[PDB]
Symmetry: D2
Subunit: 114 residues, 4 copies
């Protein structure tokens, strides 16, 4: 998997389960074409988002539906979602893991490229 997402819950101290993750790729009209999506499993990861062949260089947006996640838990959140926008770059073998640590009024996100 060239691209993985992992979502953690900073309130419960556990992975964020059943979170909706939508990925988009920037089109020539500068519009966001749906690219991949999924919902996080018990490990806080969605399964098999894309393939080496599809994940070409390009500007991608990963949108984590945090607001539904907090609502389910009964905690009013601040954000509509968490959005991570980045250019995928070819430069040797490289797997992308986008991690997001969620709290109701904040989130942090990092990319681990390996």
């Amino acid at each position: 998997c060239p691209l993985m997402v992992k979502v953690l819950d900073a309130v419960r101290g556990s992975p964020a389960i059943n979170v909706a993750v939508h990925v988009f790729r920037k089109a020539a009209d500068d519009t966001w074409e749906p690219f991949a999506s999924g919902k996080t499993s018990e490990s806080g990861e969605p399964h098999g988002l894309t393939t080496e062949e599809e994940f070409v260089e390009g500007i991608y947006k990963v949108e984590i539906d945090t607001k539904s996640y907090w609502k389910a838990l009964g905690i009013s959140p601040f954000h509509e979602h968490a959005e991570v926008v980045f250019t995928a770059n070819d430069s040797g073998p490289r797997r992308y893991t986008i991690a997001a640590l969620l709290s109701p009024y904040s989130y942090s996100t990092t990319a681990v490229v390996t």
Copy 2:
């Protein structure tokens, strides 16, 4: 000022200065409409982004141009920008401070909302 943004550089341990900040508000036809924009000063915040009258209920997006920032410092960053999208003033006016802490390959953002 009902909407303030503060941007911090976690590499340099300082406010992130000269950072472009663009704010959009979701239009009726569901597109993002320009709402406000500024650039952070030495304190890491843009000034006078909006007014209480203009900052009505809506869904807003604060886009902080982190890529141009890291690039001016000579770093090649991961993200194109940091993006903060939220519903504002849903229970009446609040004052919102969106803070973002920036690293080349990560950022964290939190909001302090006061009545």
Copy 3:
């Protein structure tokens, strides 16, 4: 004030108020000696922690009592406190703002250091 601390609650989206802050400075015999202490006000910061004269070179530890905070809000937190240990004033006096963003099972801390 050459040493300031700001504490934010990432659950409530507000400053963390009534939080105890203890500062220690590493003694010659290598133990941690009490240096300063306060409690955050409504802005999430304690006030007048130290003075330029007192805040000499050394290794400091800022311990923010996050556990008692989360417990007063009725949450059972992971950490006993958040701990920020750093060398201060090594290249001459600086002003230091230690910020900490708190969640029940995580926290992040950054320092803004100005000349």
Copy 4:
């Protein structure tokens, strides 16, 4: 492994390799007894810190030697180290992963209990 540590580098966008991780357990004199240690591997994790039998309830401190890590990279850091102090609590099956995301002037840390 009842207790795992994972260290990420927010500047390089990769795990933090060769980082020194010391774990301590609070003694009755309120002093910190060395408990476990190791250095992070290519995955940013030290290997086999402790065992189910040793990791009893108690107050633990995990100290990540961030300052040596940044020095090696040639980046002046702020912190002497990152220190994560917590009470291990028995309450059903539970593995602790202490994650830390490091930048020169900041770090965040979260516990994933699963």
